[PDB]
Amino acid sequence: VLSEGEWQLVLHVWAKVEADVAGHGQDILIRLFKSHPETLEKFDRCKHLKTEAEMKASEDLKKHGVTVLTALGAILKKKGHHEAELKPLAQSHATKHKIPIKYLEFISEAIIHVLHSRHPGDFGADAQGAMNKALELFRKDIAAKYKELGYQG
Numbered sequence: 640v641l642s643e644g645e646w647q648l649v650l651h652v653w654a655k656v657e658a659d660v661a662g663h664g665q666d667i668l669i670r671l672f673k674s675h676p677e678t679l680e681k682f683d684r685c686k687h688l689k690t691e692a693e694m695k696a697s698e699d700l701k702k703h704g705v706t707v708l709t710a711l712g713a714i715l716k717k718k719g720h721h722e723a724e725l726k727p728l729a730q731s732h733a734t735k736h737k738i739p740i741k742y743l744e745f746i747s748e749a750i751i752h753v754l755h756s757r758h759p760g761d762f763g764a765d766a767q768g769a770m771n772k773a774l775e776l777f778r779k780d781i782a783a784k785y786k787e788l789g790y791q792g
């Protein structure tokens with residue numbers, strides 16, 4: 640469980656992300672695809688992205704990144720009470736997109752990299768620790784739901 644202070648650090652930095660959801664979403668997905676290129680194979684329209692500049696110019700990539708950050712933001716604002724928000728995400732990610740927990744670890748690392756790149760002054764050790772605990776709780780709860788739906792990935 641997170642402390643109230645740890646939640647407040649997570650939501651403080653999240654309010655910075657919300658100043659430019661699209662740009663943060665682009666940088667997070669570009670970092671994910673650069674660091675772990677196998678992840679580009681999870682959506683057919685993304686095999687066409689061969690350069691960083693094409694990734695930055697893709698309206699499709701930018702809209703995907705806003706959808707990710709919008710859903711994750713709503714989950715983090717529930718401060719752990721996120722069953723109703725997490726269930727549908729687990730359903731689609733386990734049964735349709737087939738995203739393994741290791742790929743949710745990859746995108747978590749990219750989220751931490753971008754938040755520290757853009758907001759170092761508001762993302763020091765305590766804030767990084769709080770965000771890492773919040774993303775750990777997200778991945779733990781989503782994996783339990785994956786298993787309830789019969790997906791062991």
Ligand code: HEM
Pocket residue numbers: 678681682706707708710711727728731732736738742743746
């Ligand atoms: C913080 C983690 C993530 C969140 C909150 C998130 C959220 C979402 C949401 C809200 C959608 C649209 C609704 C849906 O189908 O569920 C979506 C679709 C999708 N996600 Fe994720 N996602 C996450 C991580 C990933 C990762 C790591 C991958 C691939 C490696 C991925 C692949 C997909 C695909 C292929 C779709 C459908 C895209 C489309 O049809 O245009 N997701 N995700």
Ligand SMILES: O=C1C=CC(=O)N1c1ccc(O)cc1
Pocket residue numbers: 668678679680681682685700703706707
């Ligand atoms: O799977 C792929 C390949 C490239 C791309 O943009 N995505 C994607 C990632 C996360 C997401 O939520 C939606 C789509």
